[PDB]
Design an enzyme around this catalytic site. Structure first.
Site, mmCIF file in Angstrom:
data_model
loop_
_atom_site.group_PDB
_atom_site.id
_atom_site.type_symbol
_atom_site.label_atom_id
_atom_site.label_comp_id
_atom_site.label_asym_id
_atom_site.label_seq_id
_atom_site.Cartn_x
_atom_site.Cartn_y
_atom_site.Cartn_z
ATOM 1 N N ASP B 8 30.085 51.408 46.891
ATOM 2 C CA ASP B 8 30.656 52.373 45.961
ATOM 3 C C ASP B 8 30.433 53.796 46.437
ATOM 4 O OD1 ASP B 8 31.563 50.352 44.183
ATOM 5 O OD2 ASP B 8 29.575 50.218 43.275
ATOM 6 N N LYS B 30 31.411 44.752 49.435
ATOM 7 C CA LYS B 30 32.484 44.815 48.459
ATOM 8 C C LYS B 30 33.145 46.182 48.454
ATOM 9 C CE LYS B 30 31.759 44.921 43.895
ATOM 10 N NZ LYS B 30 32.624 46.101 43.582
ATOM 11 N N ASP B 57 37.621 43.959 46.130
ATOM 12 C CA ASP B 57 37.570 43.859 44.676
ATOM 13 C C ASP B 57 38.597 44.789 44.026
ATOM 14 O OD1 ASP B 57 36.820 43.544 42.021
ATOM 15 O OD2 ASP B 57 34.996 44.753 42.216
ATOM 16 N N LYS B 59 40.857 43.398 41.526
ATOM 17 C CA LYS B 59 41.217 42.780 40.250
ATOM 18 C C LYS B 59 42.715 42.863 39.934
ATOM 19 C CE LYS B 59 36.636 43.907 38.350
ATOM 20 N NZ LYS B 59 36.260 44.757 39.512
ATOM 21 N N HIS B 61 46.226 42.345 38.539
ATOM 22 C CA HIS B 61 46.710 41.883 37.250
ATOM 23 C C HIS B 61 48.130 42.441 37.119
ATOM 24 C CE1 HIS B 61 45.726 41.545 32.640
ATOM 25 N NE2 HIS B 61 46.699 40.741 33.025
ATOM 26 N N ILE B 63 52.694 40.897 37.216
ATOM 27 C CA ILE B 63 53.572 39.736 37.099
ATOM 28 C C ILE B 63 53.356 38.843 38.322
ATOM 29 C CG2 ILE B 63 55.321 40.940 35.764
ATOM 30 C CD1 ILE B 63 56.922 41.224 38.400
ATOM 31 N N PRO B 64 53.649 37.541 38.195
ATOM 32 C CA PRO B 64 53.482 36.575 39.286
ATOM 33 C C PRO B 64 53.973 36.984 40.679
ATOM 34 C CG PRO B 64 53.873 35.405 37.290
ATOM 35 C CD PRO B 64 54.120 36.866 36.971
ATOM 36 N N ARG B 205 23.911 50.362 43.442
ATOM 37 C CA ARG B 205 23.057 51.535 43.660
ATOM 38 C C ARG B 205 21.612 51.176 43.964
ATOM 39 N NH1 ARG B 205 25.094 54.282 39.569
ATOM 40 N NH2 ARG B 205 25.057 52.366 38.302
HETATM 41 N N1 LIG Z 1 60.325 39.317 36.065
HETATM 42 C C1 LIG Z 1 60.136 40.666 36.346
HETATM 43 C C2 LIG Z 1 60.620 41.186 37.661
HETATM 44 C C3 LIG Z 1 60.379 42.583 37.865
HETATM 45 N N2 LIG Z 1 59.685 43.535 36.863
HETATM 46 C C4 LIG Z 1 59.446 45.088 37.176
HETATM 47 O O1 LIG Z 1 60.655 45.786 37.495
HETATM 48 C C5 LIG Z 1 60.673 46.076 38.966
HETATM 49 C C6 LIG Z 1 61.645 45.309 39.832
HETATM 50 O O2 LIG Z 1 62.924 45.161 39.109
HETATM 51 P P1 LIG Z 1 64.345 44.401 39.726
HETATM 52 O O3 LIG Z 1 64.237 45.118 40.899
HETATM 53 O O4 LIG Z 1 64.261 44.807 38.202
HETATM 54 O O5 LIG Z 1 63.463 43.149 40.280
HETATM 55 C C7 LIG Z 1 59.284 45.858 39.638
HETATM 56 O O6 LIG Z 1 58.841 46.983 40.309
HETATM 57 C C8 LIG Z 1 58.450 45.316 38.394
HETATM 58 O O7 LIG Z 1 57.367 46.228 38.039
HETATM 59 C C9 LIG Z 1 59.243 42.943 35.599
HETATM 60 O O8 LIG Z 1 58.679 43.584 34.728
HETATM 61 N N3 LIG Z 1 59.480 41.547 35.377
HETATM 62 N N1 LIG Z 2 28.375 47.759 33.815
HETATM 63 C C1 LIG Z 2 28.675 47.341 35.121
HETATM 64 C C2 LIG Z 2 27.988 47.995 36.251
HETATM 65 C C3 LIG Z 2 28.359 47.518 37.544
HETATM 66 N N2 LIG Z 2 29.366 46.436 37.833
HETATM 67 C C4 LIG Z 2 29.744 45.974 39.298
HETATM 68 O O1 LIG Z 2 28.692 45.993 40.304
HETATM 69 C C5 LIG Z 2 28.877 47.166 41.216
HETATM 70 C C6 LIG Z 2 27.850 48.243 40.927
HETATM 71 O O2 LIG Z 2 26.432 47.655 40.962
HETATM 72 P P1 LIG Z 2 24.976 48.506 40.501
HETATM 73 O O3 LIG Z 2 25.588 49.708 41.040
HETATM 74 O O4 LIG Z 2 24.695 46.964 40.974
HETATM 75 O O5 LIG Z 2 25.539 48.420 39.001
HETATM 76 C C7 LIG Z 2 30.339 47.701 41.026
HETATM 77 O O6 LIG Z 2 31.058 47.639 42.212
HETATM 78 C C8 LIG Z 2 30.905 46.838 39.828
HETATM 79 O O7 LIG Z 2 32.046 46.027 40.159
HETATM 80 C C9 LIG Z 2 30.019 45.804 36.675
HETATM 81 O O8 LIG Z 2 30.880 44.880 36.777
HETATM 82 N N3 LIG Z 2 29.641 46.289 35.355
#
Ligand SMILES: Nc1ccn([C@@H]2O[C@H](COP(=O)(O)O)[C@@H](O)[C@H]2O)c(=O)n1
Ligand SMILES: Nc1ccn([C@@H]2O[C@H](COP(=O)(O)O)[C@@H](O)[C@H]2O)c(=O)n1
Lengths: 229, 225
Positions: B8, B30, B57, B59, B61, B63-64, B205
């Site tokens: 970090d 990481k 790392d 994460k 999240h 669309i598929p 840390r």
């Molecule tokens: N099933 C889908 C396909 C694309 N999208 C969003 O719209 C954009 C692409 O749109 P077409 O080009 O709409 O595929 C992407 O950048 C994406 O964030 C969505 O929200 N749901």
């Molecule tokens: N409250 C917290 C503090 C640290 N962390 C994770 O551990 C790392 C930091 O570790 P210390 O600095 O181990 O906390 C970060 O990269 C973070 O992903 C967490 O997931 N939740």
């Protein structure tokens, strides 16, 4: 400046340059997703901004508060004009996101806009209940999330054109509605027309393949404007 | 090694400085959002070139299909481990796997992939009042871990407390990467973490900011028995 956001769904700068070639002189508002940013890095953003484009960094930050905050400072320094996060990250995380943006923004200047993803477009009611364990209706869950983001100080959310109206009634007309899933009446293979999107309340519409795969990109960009107007 | 060192730091410069003492010691590090968004895939290539394993790392999240193309990208950057939010759903998690596969050469295994069930900073109030999840936090974590297990992922990020319970639900070999590690002087203790069933412990840390990193790493190993 413009209601249209062009999704640069490409894995490299080269393909990005190819698409933008004919748009020289016509500054656009482009969206950089995970695919592109994770393979090109902050370099792609500096490039797009040099060309005079506005940039929407669609990375949907969803992590612990501090991490998001530190990440946003960087995103504000890189030059992003718009960024987003998942409302599922909680109010505290969303507030931290705003703190980071202000921290990475010079005095006397406007911080990048920040919107929230409520529920992804690919998330149906079934998935919501059975997988996510959220027993409440998808529509009300979206409304709740939007309100949360609004309570956190965010400027709006990502929503379908059909959700814009009720989200604004609950969060206010100024609450931004950025809507993806746009298609012209005659294409595609869950979708709405530019004009229809505007009638529903959308402030910004994300257009992708309907423009990035067009035979005539410039004439198609024009059609986008004509229909919207 | 069961230790994962959270890099970090603001940029490569700080990373280089910190790693110098570890020249003769392979590490599993990481790289989070802050550092990766600042350096790009270049930071990964560098770390690898220094003989270190890398856990990107980020994460993911989304669309598929977007997560698929994204993972195809993270596999080609060289990451050894990546993660996603189980909140994204089974389809998205399965797509991540597809992406990693399509992104891996052939002479090696696809990078491994784990899921975040619920962030370590999410308490029950946030979960019920803000996220609208009408079920206990502990049961929700097991449910999300199961979703990741069923999607074909290799494990999850969880507290050392939830380790045993998650494995009982998803399998003893189901990986348990546990953050929040601290020396006696959340509730941690490397040894305590090992007794709870953690497979890997993310140290931050407590090490990166220590007066003597190298020596703090030696102490980490010792308390781990
Ligand atoms: N099933 C889908 C396909 C694309 N999208 C969003 O719209 C954009 C692409 O749109 P077409 O080009 O709409 O595929 C992407 O950048 C994406 O964030 C969505 O929200 N749901
Ligand atoms: N409250 C917290 C503090 C640290 N962390 C994770 O551990 C790392 C930091 O570790 P210390 O600095 O181990 O906390 C970060 O990269 C973070 O992903 C967490 O997931 N939740």
């Amino acid at each position: 400046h413009t209601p249209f956001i062009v999704a640069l769904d490409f894995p490299s700068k080269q393909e990005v340059e190819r698409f933008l070639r004919p748009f020289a002189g016509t500054p656009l508002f482009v969206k950089v997703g995970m695919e592109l940013y994770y393979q090109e890095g902050p370099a792609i953003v500096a490039f797009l901004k040099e060309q005079g484009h506005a940039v929407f960094l669609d990375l949907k930050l969803h992590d612990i508060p501090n991490t998001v905050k530190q990440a946003m400072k960087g995103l504000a320094r890189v030059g992003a004009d718009l960024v987003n996060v998942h409302a599922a990250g909680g109010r505290r995380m969303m507030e931290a996101a705003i703190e980071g943006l202000d921290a990475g923004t010079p005095s006397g200047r406007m911080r990048p806009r920040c919107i929230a993803v409520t529920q992804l477009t690919s998330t149906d009611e079934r998935m919501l209940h059975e997988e996510l364990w959220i027993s409440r209706p998808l529509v009300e869950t979206v409304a709740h999330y939007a309100a949360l983001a609004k309570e956190s100080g965010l400027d709006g959310v990502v929503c379908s054109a059909n959700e814009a109206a009720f989200i604004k009634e609950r969060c206010g007309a100024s609450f931004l509605a950025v809507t993806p899933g746009i298609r012209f009446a005659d294409d595609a293979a869950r979708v709405v027309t530019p004009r229809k999107a505007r009638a529903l309340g959308s402030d910004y519409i994300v257009i992708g393949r309907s423009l990035t795969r067009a035979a005539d990109p410039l004439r198609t960009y024009a059609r986008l404007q004509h229909e919207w107007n």
